[PDB]
Amino acid sequence: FQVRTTGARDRVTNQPIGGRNVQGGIRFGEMERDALLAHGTSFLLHDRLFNCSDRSVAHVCVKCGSLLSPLLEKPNRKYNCTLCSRSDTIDTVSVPYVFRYFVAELAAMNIKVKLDVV
Amino acid sequence: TGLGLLQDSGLCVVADKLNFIRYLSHFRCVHRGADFAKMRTTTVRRLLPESWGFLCPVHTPDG
Amino acid sequence: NMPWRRLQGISFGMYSAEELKKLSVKSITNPRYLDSLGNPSANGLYDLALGPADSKEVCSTCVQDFSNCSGHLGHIELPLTVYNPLLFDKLYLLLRGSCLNCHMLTCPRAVIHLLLCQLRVLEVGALQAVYELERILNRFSASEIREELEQYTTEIVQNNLLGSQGAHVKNVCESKSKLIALFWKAHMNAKRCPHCKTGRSVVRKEHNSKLTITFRGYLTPTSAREHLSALWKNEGFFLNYLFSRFNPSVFFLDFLVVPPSRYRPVSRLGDQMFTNGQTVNLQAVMKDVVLIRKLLALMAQEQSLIDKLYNIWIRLQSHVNIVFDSEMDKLMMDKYPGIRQILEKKEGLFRKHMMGKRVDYAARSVICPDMYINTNEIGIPMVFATKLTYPQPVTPWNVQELRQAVINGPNVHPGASMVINEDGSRTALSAVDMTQREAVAKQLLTQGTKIVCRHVKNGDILLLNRQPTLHRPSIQAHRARILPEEKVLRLHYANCKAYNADFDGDEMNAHFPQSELGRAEAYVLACTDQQYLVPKDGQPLAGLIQDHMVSGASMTTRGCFFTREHYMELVYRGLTDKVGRVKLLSPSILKPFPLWTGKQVVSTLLINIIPEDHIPLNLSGKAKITGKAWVKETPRSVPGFNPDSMCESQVIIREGELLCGVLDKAHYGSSAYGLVHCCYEIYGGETSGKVLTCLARLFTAYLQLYRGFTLGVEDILVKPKADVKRQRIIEESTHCGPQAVRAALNLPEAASYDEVRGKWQDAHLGKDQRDFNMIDLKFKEEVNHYSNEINKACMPFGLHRQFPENSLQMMVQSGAKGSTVNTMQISCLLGQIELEGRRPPLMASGKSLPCFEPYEFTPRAGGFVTGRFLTGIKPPEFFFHCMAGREGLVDTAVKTSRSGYLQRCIIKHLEGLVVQYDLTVRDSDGSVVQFLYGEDGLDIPKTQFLQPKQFPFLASNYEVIMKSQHLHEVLSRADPKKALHHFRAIKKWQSKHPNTLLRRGAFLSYSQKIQEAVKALKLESENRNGRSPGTQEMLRMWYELDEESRRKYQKKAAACPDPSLSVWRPDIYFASVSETFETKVDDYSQEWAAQTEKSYEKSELSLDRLRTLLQLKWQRSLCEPGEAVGLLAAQSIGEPSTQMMNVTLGIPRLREILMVASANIKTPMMSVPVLNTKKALKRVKSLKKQLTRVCLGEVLQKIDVQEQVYQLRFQFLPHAYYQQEKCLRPEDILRFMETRFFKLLMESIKKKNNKASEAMERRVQAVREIHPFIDDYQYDTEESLWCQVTVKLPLMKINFDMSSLVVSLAHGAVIYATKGITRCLLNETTNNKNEKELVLNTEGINLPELFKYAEVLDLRRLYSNDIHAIANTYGIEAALRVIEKEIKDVFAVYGIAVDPRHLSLVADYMCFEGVYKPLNRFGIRSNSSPLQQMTFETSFQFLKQATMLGSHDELRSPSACLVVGKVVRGGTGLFELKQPL
Amino acid sequence: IVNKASWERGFAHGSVYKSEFIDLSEKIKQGDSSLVFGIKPGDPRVLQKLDDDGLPFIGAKLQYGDPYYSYLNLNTGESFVMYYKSKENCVVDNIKVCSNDTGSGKFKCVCITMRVPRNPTIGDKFASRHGQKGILSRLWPAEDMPFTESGMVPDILFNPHGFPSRMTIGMLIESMAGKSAALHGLCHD
Amino acid sequence: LGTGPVVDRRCPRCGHEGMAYHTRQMRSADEGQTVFYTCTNCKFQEKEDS
Amino acid sequence: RITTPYMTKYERARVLGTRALQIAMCAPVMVELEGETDPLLIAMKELKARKIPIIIRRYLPDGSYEDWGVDELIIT
DNA sequence: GTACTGTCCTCTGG
DNA sequence: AGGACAGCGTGTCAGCAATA
RNA sequence: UGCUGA
Ligand SMILES: [Mg+2]
Ligand SMILES: [Zn+2]
Prior knowledge:
CATH superfamily of chain F: RNA polymerase subunit, RPB6/omega
Bound molecules: magnesium ion, zinc ion
Strand content of chain F: 5-15%
Helix content of chain F: 25-40%
Oligomer: part of a larger assembly
Structural class of chain F: alpha+beta
Order of helices and strands of chain F: HHEE
Strand content of chain C: 5-15%
Subcellular location (chain E): Nucleus, Nucleolus
CATH class of chain F: Alpha Beta
CATH topology of chain F: Eukaryotic RPB6 RNA polymerase subunit
Shape of chain C: globular
Strand order of the largest sheet of chain C: 8-19-15-16
Radius of gyration of chain F: 13 Å
Organism (chain E): Homo sapiens (Human)
Distance between the termini of chain F: 19 Å
Number of strands of chain C: 37
Structural class of chain C: alpha+beta
Largest sheet of chain F: 2 strands, antiparallel
Radius of gyration of chain C: 41 Å
Family (chain E): Belongs to the archaeal RpoM/eukaryotic RPA12/RPB9/RPC11 RNA polymerase family.
Strand order of the largest sheet of chain F: 1-2
Number of helices of chain F: 2
Helix content of chain C: 25-40%
Largest sheet of chain C: 4 strands, antiparallel
Number of helices of chain C: 46
Protein name (chain E): DNA-directed RNA polymerase I subunit RPA12
Protein name (chain B): DNA-directed RNA polymerase I subunit RPA2
């Protein structure tokens, strides 16, 4: 028998840990999201994944569309873009951590993920 | 040299005394091989009529 | 306060390598990353500028701790350049086809410029420009070609701009994919150089990390880099389009990027406490960098030194490779998995942590039967309820009940674990002092209000899931009925079949929505009463099971009488009514003693459940229990009685009062059109759930109070005097082996008793093994005759107790549980065991089991079990039964393993297809798949009662249907004129043209003067220009000798008006229905106005109110916009397969059709009807005998080879036994040897010897004219008496038993055969309606080689299972229907029946872009979504592609929408809300 | 279904023995002995849950959050209570103190056996000798069970619908054989 | 030159009067045996679950 | 102006969800609630009275949209 | 496992 | 241009010990 | 990796 609410968030992906010995979450799976969207309950599938799993609040160089570029001054702590020296372009975007983890992994190969902020 | 064996794992297993019918069945088990657990064709799972009196028809794991 | 900013698009490109700098906090140089004690060593991989890896530290780059710091990137600076492993292969090609001297590609500039212009036009979307440019080229120096093409290309790109946003669509990505793939595949091969003839400096790459130019030097990444740098300069205009402004520098790496330390977490491995696999690969690169930096200094302080430099280079590349793809380099060890393995697999990062995240606020526990909670409820065991918390905001109208919850505390049930503050957060109440919780019960309502995380409160909504989720009904929402003292989640038994739950240890998950906007959807959409009908075929899913079926069938039987007090307390115990009086009935029997009927109990329970305002329903149908089950005693002839007019087989509910019928599974069950299905149609899904609940409670009270159900041994027993016949039949069955086998080997009818054993042994040790299966089949036949005789003797009437009073019957016979084949096989026979469709296999000595003699004829030795489970089965039969039962489980496992993959592939391709607001089924990029969902709209579950034969129900219940749903309001707010006039026009047209295939035309209509012309006018001419002498007179009279504008033969010959759904928008246009529905409505109105005339019941409905009723019920069953029907089609094709004779069957065929789309199928076939004429029937015999293949080997007795002078005599067979059905003659056969076999023989002799170290006369002469080895053959003036040949190779040849060659060749040598056809056969009868049909089936496929017999066979009605051959002879719109029919016939062999609206969508998607495209990994290449297409399979190839093409993603798929955290673009997310100011 | 009075009179009661080997050569490497089971005198943490050798009492009941052992680094002189973290109740029934194979070990290794009572709850799987498995769904009160004309009252209720599709006719014969045995004092084969 | 209908019990699908059945245990060891029916007048295969 | 006049079930679900998430964030209830603590029951009460000032913006597959009022939409 | 793509591989055509 | 062939692929669902 | 549960 298992019930998990919140608990060990895996550090690499910011997701519930699993197992039953710790709080232990229940993998949702690729087979189940399909049924949840068949019903057309997009918001239930949004709430569950984003809010009960990795919902992060990252910053983007809106002009240059790079997750990696925004920077914090050593202690005001106003974000400034490293690639282009503009500090007022930076704005926040809701995104997962595995999305950030994937941008990092893709950079680990010289590939660039340029994202269009709106 | 693999000892003329063809298998390099599952050679020894834990004998668990959950019951005396779990224990007594570890000394009468015969494993066709651990590699055959990964096979598309199922022909080493056929219960041929030549194992009459040597292997039990009913006593086989069921998964 | 969320970021508020959303994503529109994600593009994948390559980083400059100069902008990665400034994306780097510091360069790392220290190899040893783990400190002596386990902390980060400065300047190592784990550093404090690359971020705090753990909460203990703070980053040096930005002061901030873990969980708040976005990590930073660093770089191992490499000693010298290395090639990048992903852009490497392309580099190789960019160097294979090129002149290292000239620095220009070896391709003809025509191809270069053509492809350049095609890419320039594709970038804007213009798709006809592609072929237009290619044809402009072919129809046409280098400047000359460029100016010819660039004018047209610039004109296109200018006149067709504004289309850069409308270019990311399928059919524009497939074209670019194909163009660039063809370029890389056909024009980059090594070639002699154009300008200098000797410019092939052949780059030829060994294993990765090795490129070798010849004069065998080793290509140093610096020399290759300079070559690319100087080749870009000359050929850049062209490559900047083949790669996006790619710089050649990106093809090479001067540093490696170390990812942030938060994404590299130290775990443990054997004998190492702190290690990440990614840091162990990067550490190997750092260590080689250090050794190489030493050798360079050694050269500076200065063949072995530079051979060592070239070896350490190759080693540093094979490490930088491993860092990118663990298995790019196979010769290195200590190789942990690279990034290709971090991303691309089932473990992976997309199929886990991307599509399958782990969720909070969820429970999982064993489920238990409840039955005393309503069908829409789940029982929560007070241990989840006290932990699962919903975070509700505090407002003036809830602050009272929230205050009690904060006072009750974290551990009492209506309580709360925490309260979140307006600006702060998370002040937990979990203390148990009970005073601070009161100190905080105030200050509620004392910006965003405090939110109380309350517990589950007995009305909440929960999503419940069972893990093999194969359909939409496997996730449904339930209403949180809290139960005290348990750890199990209790669920009603009506919801079992939906989940497939079985209460044998059946863990199930329960999710708790936390948004108040997912609760609205769990209530409205995912609710468990909107899920009454399965989406596969619209048939009901919820229903009562087991003893609610044997209870209701024994109470509703005719002889069940109840006193007032058992009548009551049986009504109130089913109702448990809470609102209003229970309306009762009158006794059926009023006099000797007032008594009720049991059908009256169900009646009075039915008139209380139906909503007060609505009126009870009328219903007429059939029961599951046949009216023959009750016939005890022989039926006698009553002269005027139709026994079925008054039978317990016909269910007749008249105004909610059951008047006749048993009401078994056919109602209350999962069968369609029953009482609960009609309740769900007329009164909604909540009323059907109420009916199910109340009927379950009633049928439980009945068995628990006054009756009882059991299953003893006196209902499986069999009468004596009936087991004597069974025993005599079993004795007779022990003598049917010899005859069976013998008459299957076509042996002498008798006199052979040992030749038969030898023939069986030969057939068993044979190679083909198809004369053995013949015996197996013709043997499971005498045995089957005795079983039929045995089941009939005992099962119907040989049982000790009969059906009304038997407990096994009345359980299999009312649909409760089991089957007549379970009932038998428990009594009077177990049957014939069959393992692979064949009898049990024999040993290697010819015995099936150690107890049986070898080759024993008795059926007992072949698995014919005559024992029953009543009196057990003997040891040998036990063995065969175990073999069968075990193969069953093995097959289950393997079948599920294959079905899962099939369904995953299907669901991954058809997922983005949703119905739009213009009723058209479009994909994610807007590509129109269908212009109307089912070809008419009309989602499946709502079209169940729109079938005919269900109108007499809608007519009977008309008043309830109009009041409950449409109402008088909609009927009179309908205006049908536009659609009604269209159907009148269609009807008039079809009235003037009965035969709609008669070649209508204006001029054709002006051939009625045909006699006028043929009489005298045209009698004098010849075929002037090939037409005729008499056709020219008609042409002259028609052409200009007719009226100017009043020559209107046109109107008499004009097209049928186009269908109404096509022009008149079925949703907003009343009376615009399908052409097949209006025909049904006309037929029924005509057959219903002629029933009212002789009805003795007053009907207050008129044909023209019934018509409006049906038209409204159609217009309302119209597939709401946003339905996402492709996912439903995927799941409907998947679930039936996952669960569940010369052709293929099962998942093999489904995978051939859908996933592979092969041109080679295992069993191709054809079926042309035979034309039904006396001449055709006679010609067909010859046709069948004409297309079968006759092979040299099928006509031969034995060869006689003598041996360097190798003679050969063929000795052919006599015509007695092969000319009968092969249509051959000896001169043709022998002539074949002279011209084909006797030269293929020398062909094979050379095949071996190349790598070894009056009239007889003309025939012989021409034959040796052509070959120099033969000498002279023979002649056979009398039926091929002796026909040998002689050869000789006199010098030195390998004299062996060459008979091997001349026998391996005399098998694949076929006299003559139609290409592709292996055999024909005329299956005499294929129809009962018009039994006269004949079919010429075939086992090969050649469509054109049948076109010559358009008079012997019907070439319309020709069918084949190939779907690639049909698509090549008849087109793609004809292959669509073959695909649909193939899927339907595959599902039909198992009784499954998927709705045609799903196969229509699947076939329309597969054949979308003109070709039969497979639904698999190669079908996604023509897909406009890089984020999809990489969440499926080969994620790294699809990422490399999307990266070297700059491919842009629009975030419109479900996968791309769930990857970047958006709301899917179908179902509930398809529109905005736009609060007005 | 299981009668509730049969379940309260000891029907199918059981237990589990969880033996945990605490070798305390962990938490340390080859340094000074940080390992001796022991309590520094007066620790408020182990006031009365341990017995002066940092080991629970034999017979004591353990619950999550209870003290479970107390090491003592001999050189420094510091104790560590190491709390019981299983979310289930048990009773310590024995504690083996083990040596090093040369009879020279120093109070570093022990083996504690806990006893966990596992009586038939709802959700437990029962089975017959014929493959007829099934969870326990209710504990039916003993006064709501159908009593026979002999005064008896079943203690297992088995739905008769598992027979028709599974054809376990051996259970219907075992019932009669066992009833005849209990009646005549015999023992049938 | 010289030297398969089953036992058929009665159930209808399209017409009537007697199908024919092959029993195979296409299930696990905790379930029961599936039955495969086939008609006479036509050839329509059933494939029940029990 | 050309799409269906009725309110699809997905639209009803999303409108109820949004109105409920608004009510729960202390928004004025124009429906005269009568002692119910569920914001979704209140949202249904408002939908039945035809008091929801939200604009369903139906998007067509080419970007073109049509703005419908929740009041001017036939709720089944 | 089999069947697909792919991959050239280099053999007769202007 | 007839091939020969080397080359990728997937594979329902959750637990425990234990150990790399 | 050996087990086990649907
Ligand atoms: Mg089960
Ligand atoms: Zn920037």
